[model samples]
Target chain A: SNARRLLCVEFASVASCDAAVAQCFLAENDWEMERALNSYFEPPV
Target chain B: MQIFVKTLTGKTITLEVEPSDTIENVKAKIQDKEGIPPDQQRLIFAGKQLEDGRTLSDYNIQKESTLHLVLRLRGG
Candidate 1:
């Protein structure tokens, strides 16, 4: 399992938070935090 | 098995899921239908968290059971 050293990242709040879902993106993005964040936050345009 | 998911937006869907399907798989299916990001989805069943890493059988999810989806939101 070539997992990353980054296991968890904390968010300020769960209200309007999608950290769990973002974590899925994180894993899919090879633990690239910025990529995951952008994809997760990308607005449908 | 047939899985019923209720989105917070008053939209509901039924999915045919295999016992081997993990919560992540279910989330993906739901994402396809709902256009909601997987990271924003909070899947719950019978008041229990549906772990993405675990399969449906791990939670003993039944055919007629209803799963709840709570979208994680943030704003003051």
Candidate 2:
């Protein structure tokens, strides 16, 4: 319970990251940061 | 699938979605309609912090159901 958790994955992008947009997908995907990134980019249909 | 989510702002939003739609997708939809940015939503269901990787069926969410919508507080 200190400085890290699941969403701790790399940013890997320069023009990205914010609380508002992040939480949307964060809550959407239940806080799995990597999963959120996939949906934002990979987008399974 | 269809579901009704009661927002913290006192409006029940009607969401038309597929079973694969992540909880974040619904937040996006709500933001689209209500103009409340999606990340501001801290969604909780079944006593859990609804993450972005799961599906509706993961929590057995059904039609005509109401999810508890809470605003995320980053203020300190």
Candidate 3:
């Protein structure tokens, strides 16, 4: 799950959030880099 | 087994659970952490609603699976 960690790092660092929290977001978005990041900026409906 | 419950409002609640745990059990656990009543919490996964009688395995919920949580509107 190195890719997950890498994406988590990118997400947490840029969002100023926690890795655990970022991990959840990544999982929620199916581990897609763009979708995970975009989900943070725009909450789902 | 660990899974995530993500609210539409952007909050995610992590849960340590088992495949044998029923949907009602998961809701109760969520209530303990999120302060939302079981009746008020609507859980959705893979575009389907989770019934109270079904277990995680019934829904094929995997580790790290994220279930969408929608709060029922109250007093409206």
| Candidate 2 per-residue lDDT over residues A1-45, each given as its tens digit | 222232432212211455466557656876655455445543257
In terms of lDDT, which candidate is strongest?
A: 3
**Reference-based TM-score of each model:** 0.58, 0.56, 0.62
Better by TM-score, candidate 2 or 1: 1
- The sequence of per-residue lDDT tens digits that candidate 1 reaches over residues B1-76 is 7888976445678888998899999999988886888988777665455778999889888787777676665454
**DockQ for candidate 1:** 0.03
Candidate 3 overall lDDT versus native: 0.79
lDDT score for residue A8 of model 2: 32
Q: How do the residues B10-37 of candidate 2 rate in per-residue lDDT, one tens digit apiece?
A: 5788878877788888789888877878
**lDDT-sorted candidate list, best first:** 3, 1, 2
Candidate 2 wrong stretches, greater than 4 Å:
A1-45, B74-76
Descending-DockQ candidate ranking: 3, 1, 2
Clashes of each: 7, 12, 0
Cand. 1 TM to true fold: 0.58
How close to the true structure is residue B39 of candidate 1, measured as C-alpha lDDT?
Answer: 88
Pairs in clash, predicted candidate 3? none
DockQ of each: 0.03, 0.03, 0.04
